[PDB]
Nucleic acid binder design. Structure first.
Lengths: 71, 178, 74, 119, 91, 169, 123, 75, 16, 107
RNA sequence: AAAUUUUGGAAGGUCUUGGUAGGAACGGGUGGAUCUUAUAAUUUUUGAUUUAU
RNA sequence: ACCUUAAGAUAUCAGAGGAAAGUCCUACUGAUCAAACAUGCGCUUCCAAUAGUAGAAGGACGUUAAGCAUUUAUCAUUGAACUGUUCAUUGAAGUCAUUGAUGCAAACUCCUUGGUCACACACACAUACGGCGCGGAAGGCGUG
């Protein structure tokens, strides 16, 4: 329908809180109309253990997607 | 089909930037400014007062208030009250828009001036300023103007006083300043 | 590279064990039919609230929203 | 076949709507929106006490019941008599219909019968 | 819908919105979409237990928003009036 | 005066939450199984309601379905107009219900000679069902008359519109 | 207050409602628009029962007195997903006759202004 | 460049890269294995699925994991 | 075109 | 056959739409509930809030919300060691379809 | 039934209550409400907030 | 410079007529429903002292007020004494508050709101109470 306005967050480090407790930081690579996001070089902030080279996050469990860069 | 309610122009159905283009132009940027000026102007101009419930005064309450005196009512003509209302509204607007910035002029030569008062190189709201004035750069050092008093600055502006009470001022100053 | 819809079509009259997400409750039985929303009907299914089996169940209709995974038993 | 259409046929009858919180609303039932957005009028909200000493109750339900504004200060149990509570559709869990009505005359889906005759 | 259009009209002004997790956010509203996704700028966040921090931007999914507090002056918006006149849209 | 009017409210005060955290929110887990009920409570339920109440609203549904399955085979159930081949014979359709055989013969003789005429009427009542069979002395004349009566907005029926065409036999 | 039996959410415009949420928080403000049933409230103040005083509502002085923490927040649009149920509390400031009067007033003014706008924009 | 999540899952399927799927909490389990196929709604079939609590879990075989529970799919 | 599911179909179907 | 079943619901025609609904109710997972209504055998429905109901279905629907009579709500409330078994009888009941988990047909 | 009553209508009297500048008919590549279907598949209504084992 | 569209419908059943089976329509006809507008009910609730300096409803994001009673203010590493306790050092986070928070209660001050209407300063009532002045607000019900 309407693609979310994330064309300015491309290839910039962001930190988004999975569900209500987890917080994942990575480099955004793409997104879908459901607000699914694929972010590379993830790191589960808590010491903090990396996730993998390429992860996808279902847009249902995303709450906020604040960006840790110039934007 | 969605139209702007300020411009009143009927816009072919859009949802993307087409609505971010219309709302970011000038016929929808200042024509939405004139609208809310008028609506806020009204709520300033409103003079309707609360409903008045008048109770029948009793004898004990009437006799004392009738004893004292009658009080004269001051009244103006139509043109005079027109002029007075215009003056009062203008004075209210002028005072409401007034902002005091003496502290900004006082610290004009501070060692860390360009990083705080310039308001474009600040760290909190500088991210907004960072197609469209001799701006003060952040790279200024205190070596520039080692001695501020070398005729560079000017005297502090004298304090303002109310004009309607301008005859209240003392006639002569204590000392003779040239 | 089989998709879930052809997979669930192929699982018809096959012993499958579907587990709900609540209490590791697992139903093991033959799959009779499926809907486009993956509603499942099981025949002669046995209930496993845990590793212990509770009993035998005649025919159960399982709502689509509860199943966590549908797996093919050997 | 949509049971919301059957539910729309009551329209003036006493129901007992039990929400998902646990609170049960009793009152005359007015029109029902096609999303099951019930509108009851002469209602008497109540909260079932679980009858077990150590199991206390829902708490958010008590908060909502009191904040409705109709709770009797001297009431021993949690009841709040008020008029016209509008209930959102997704909150209803089950609706206890009256005993007296006939189901055979109300359950006949006129639209489905019309479609079957037309086909 | 009227509330979505009101949130659209509320662009460029400081709004305060509380999520379903308990957090609170306030700041300039850059952009909003028809599905209640909002982008706040210079937001001052209050995590549920009371701690307050600051971030440059944020993009919160609309499915989690509880309510959004816009400036009070928007009560006089032209799209809140019921009887309206239309320009007779062309062919 | 650009944004001097849209002054927002003061920041909202903080109150300690009274609900459950987003991480702790869940519906009821440990939902006990359904197998235990079948052994004990089902026997009591079946013993105390032997038989269920009749399903009456399906009666009307299956009744109207019976009409559909009853109309078709009954219409299909079946097997003065047995004249010669229709190469020279003419046929008419959509004639009046209260018309007669002599009037139809005269109308057909208005634009072609008639050798044999026999109108077939419905068996229920002695009223002309709107069909009249007229044998013509010239197939070309009969075809021309039929074409004229079909192109001229239908032949003049007493209480209807009577279009004409081939017998199609 | 008494409210008409045949009164949907469209009739309760400028009534001062009592909107209840899933998390035990109520909102008390004037309804001015709706839609998914997500309202717009004018001056709604949010109330809640603190966990320290929740225990007084449980069944057992004779009359309960609950101190409810309330926050002031203005012209807020709710989301229909969280709304649980709505109750009515107070009537609008204006009577029904005065409401009809102002509606007729604004309709007359709008018709005249539209006629003048057409007359200006054509010629 | 931009790669959609659907294309990322397609790449996982094509290169058979093992993935560890995070089922969301109050379930407290993870699934490790290889993606054989995915759907519209993030429904995935998994071969050689391994059950891991949150490492003494039991293999499950080939399963179809409904997408309404998936939270992450990381390699 | 209705819910985003149809649009995602008209992407996944081409992807396969 | 396969094409019409897999075919997205926004391009089939009206007649084929209600034909699909009837086919889903006759040959499908809800055929269980349809049979249970038709031969009038009790069903044991396990709700989301740990409530088991034993009743006879009189009308069901796409979203699996059914009208039931002779309902007998059975549920247990527990805390620690203590347990109490409570039961409630309801004459005629409407039931929303978002709560049900598994619907068992009586043997 | 031409005497009586009840029911319907016409006219007149009395009392009251409301209105007083628009209204009817026709029309369309006219706006908005309501309803049905896509739509029970991650962004609102076909259940993860009765705090549980 | 970007944009040019989800599709349908507008009370409902039953009866008569017109274009075998539907199909459509009727300034056709019944019954039900819904809306508007008039119009009524011995309908129900509410509408503030002046014969006085009051009172009712709702607020205060008001004061007394640091009120009266409780309760809170980090984690890891290393050294030293010590029978857990005390002192120092490195690293890690860390909403402000402690005149706070929470529990209880009272006085005071002030805001908005209302028919501050008319006739009365009156011996009533068991069928318990002329609801037998004009308006207004809000609902319930009935008719056209």
């Amino acid at each position: 329908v309407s693609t979310p306005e994330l064309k300015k967050y491309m290839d910039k480090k962001i930190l988004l809180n999975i569900n209500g407790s987890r917080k994942v930081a990575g480099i955004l690579r793409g997104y879908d109309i459901f607000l699914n996001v694929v972010l590379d070089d993830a790191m589960e902030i808590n010491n903090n253990h990396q996730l993998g080279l390429q992860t996808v996050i279902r847009g249902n469990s995303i709450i906020s997607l604040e960006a840790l860069d110039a934007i | 089909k969605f139209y702007c309610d300020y411009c009143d122009t009927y816009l072919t159905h859009d949802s993307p930037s087409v609505r971010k283009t219309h709302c970011s132009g000038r016929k929808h940027k200042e024509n939405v400014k004139d609208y809310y000026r008028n609506k806020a102007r009204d709520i300033i101009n409103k003079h309707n007062h609360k409903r008045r419930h008048i109770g029948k005064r009793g004898r004990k309450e009437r006799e004392n208030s009738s004893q004292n005196e009658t009080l004269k009512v001051t009244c103006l003509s139509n043109k005079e009250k027109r002029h007075i209302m215009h003056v009062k509204k203008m004075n209210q607007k002028e005072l409401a828009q007034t902002s005091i910035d003496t502290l900004k002029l006082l610290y004009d030569g501070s060692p860390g001036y360009s990083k705080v008062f310039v308001d474009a190189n600040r760290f909190d709201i500088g991210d907004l300023v960072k197609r469209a004035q001799t701006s003060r750069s952040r790279d200024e050092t205190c070596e520039s103007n080692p001695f501020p008093r070398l005729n560079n600055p000017k005297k502090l502006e004298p304090p303002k006083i109310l004009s309607q009470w301008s005859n209240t001022i003392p006639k002569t100053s204590i000392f003779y300043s040239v | 590279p089989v998709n879930p819809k052809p997979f669930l079509k192929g699982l018809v009259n096959h012993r499958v064990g579907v587990k709900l997400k609540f209490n590791s409750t697992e139903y093991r039985g033959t799959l009779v039919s499926t809907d486009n929303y993956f509603n499942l009907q099981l025949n002669e299914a046995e209930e496993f609230v845990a590793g212990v089996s509770h009993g035998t169940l005649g025919e159960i209709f399982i709502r689509c929203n509860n199943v966590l995974y549908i797996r093919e038993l050997p | 076949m949509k049971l919301v259409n059957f539910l729309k046929k009551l329209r003036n009858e006493q129901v007992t709507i039990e929400l998902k919180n646990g609170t049960t609303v009793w009152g005359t039932l007015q029109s029902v929106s096609p999303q099951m957005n019930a509108i009851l009028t002469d209602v008497k909200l109540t909260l079932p006490q679980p009858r077990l000493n150590k199991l206390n109750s829902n708490g958010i339900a008590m908060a909502s019941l009191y904040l409705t504004g109709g709770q009797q200060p001297t009431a021993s149990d949690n009841i709040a008599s008020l008029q016209y509570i509008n209930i959102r559709g997704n909150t209803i869990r089950q609706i206890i219909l009256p005993d007296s009505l006939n189901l055979d005359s109300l359950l006949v889906d006129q639209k489905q019968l019309n479609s079957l005759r037309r086909s | 819908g009227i509330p979505v259009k009101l949130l659209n009209e509320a662009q460029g002004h400081i709004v305060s919105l509380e999520l379903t997790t308990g957090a609170t956010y306030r700041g300039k509203l850059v952009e909003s979409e028809d599905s209640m996704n909002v982008q706040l700028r210079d937001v001052i966040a209050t995590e549920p237990q009371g701690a307050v921090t600051h971030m440059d931007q944020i993009f919160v999914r609309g499915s989690q928003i509880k309510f959004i507090v816009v400036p009070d002056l928007l009560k006089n918006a032209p799209l809140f009036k019921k009887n309206s006149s239309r320009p007779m849209p062309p062919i | 005066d650009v944004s001097r009017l849209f002054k927002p409210r003061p920041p909202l005060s903080y109150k300690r939450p009274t609900d459950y955290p987003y991480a702790k929110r869940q519906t009821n887990p440990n939902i006990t199984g359904v197998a235990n009920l079948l052994s004990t409570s089902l026997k009591h339920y079946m013993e105390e309601f032997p038989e269920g109440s009749p399903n009456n609203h399906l009666q009307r549904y299956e009744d109207i379905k019976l009409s559909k399955i009853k109309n078709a085979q009954l219409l299909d159930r079946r097997l003065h107009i047995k004249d010669t081949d229709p190469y020279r014979t003419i046929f008419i359709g959509r004639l009046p219900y209260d018309l007669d055989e002599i009037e139809l013969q005269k109308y057909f003789v208005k634009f072609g000679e008639i050798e044999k005429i026999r109108i077939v009427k419905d068996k229920i009542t002695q009223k002309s069902k709107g069909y009249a069979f007229i044998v013509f002395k010239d197939p070309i004349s009969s075809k021309m008359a039929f074409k004229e009566i079909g192109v001229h907005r239908g032949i003049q029926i007493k209480d209807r519109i009577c279009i004409v065409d081939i017998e199609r036999g | 207050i008494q409210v008409a039996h045949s009164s949907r959410l469209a009739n309760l415009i400028d009534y001062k409602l009592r909107v209840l949420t899933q998390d035990g928080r109520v909102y008390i403000g004037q309804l001015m628009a709706f839609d998914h049933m997500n309202l717009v409230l004018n001056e709604c103040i949010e109330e809640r029962v603190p966990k320290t005083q929740l225990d007084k509502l449980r069944p057992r002085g004779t009359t309960l007195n609950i101190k409810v923490e309330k926050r002031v927040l203005g012209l807020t649009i709710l989301r229909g997903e969280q709304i649980l149920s709505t109750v009515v509390e107070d009537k609008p400031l204006l009577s029904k006759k005065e409401r009809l009067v102002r509606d007729k007033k604004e309709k007359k003014q709008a018709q005249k202004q539209t006629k003048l706008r057409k007359e200006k924009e054509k010629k | 460049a931009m790669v959609p999540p659907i294309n990322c899952i397609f790449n996982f399927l094509q290169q058979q890269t093992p993935v560890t799927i995070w089922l969301f909490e109050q379930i407290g389990i993870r699934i490790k294995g290889k993606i054989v196929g995915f759907d519209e709604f993030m429904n995935v079939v998994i071969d050689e699925a391994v059950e891991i609590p949150v490492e003494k879990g039991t293999p499950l075989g080939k399963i179809l994991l409904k997408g309404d529970n998936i939270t992450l799919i990381t390699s | 075109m209705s819910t985003p599911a149809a649009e995602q179909r008209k992407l996944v179907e081409q992807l396969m | 056959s396969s094409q019409i079943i897999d075919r997205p619901k926004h391009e089939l025609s009206r007649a084929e739409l209600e034909e699909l609904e009837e086919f889903e109710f006759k040959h499908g997972p809800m055929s269980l509930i349809n049979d249970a209504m038709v031969t009038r055998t009790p069903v044991i429905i396990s709700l989301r809030n740990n409530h088991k109901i034993i009743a006879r279905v009189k009308a069901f629907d796409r979203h699996c919300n059914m009208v039931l009579e002779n309902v007998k709500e059975l549920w247990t409330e527990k805390k620690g060691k203590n347990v109490i078994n409570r039961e409630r009888f309801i004459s005629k009941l409407f039931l929303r379809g978002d709560s049900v988990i598994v619907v068992l047909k009586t043997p």
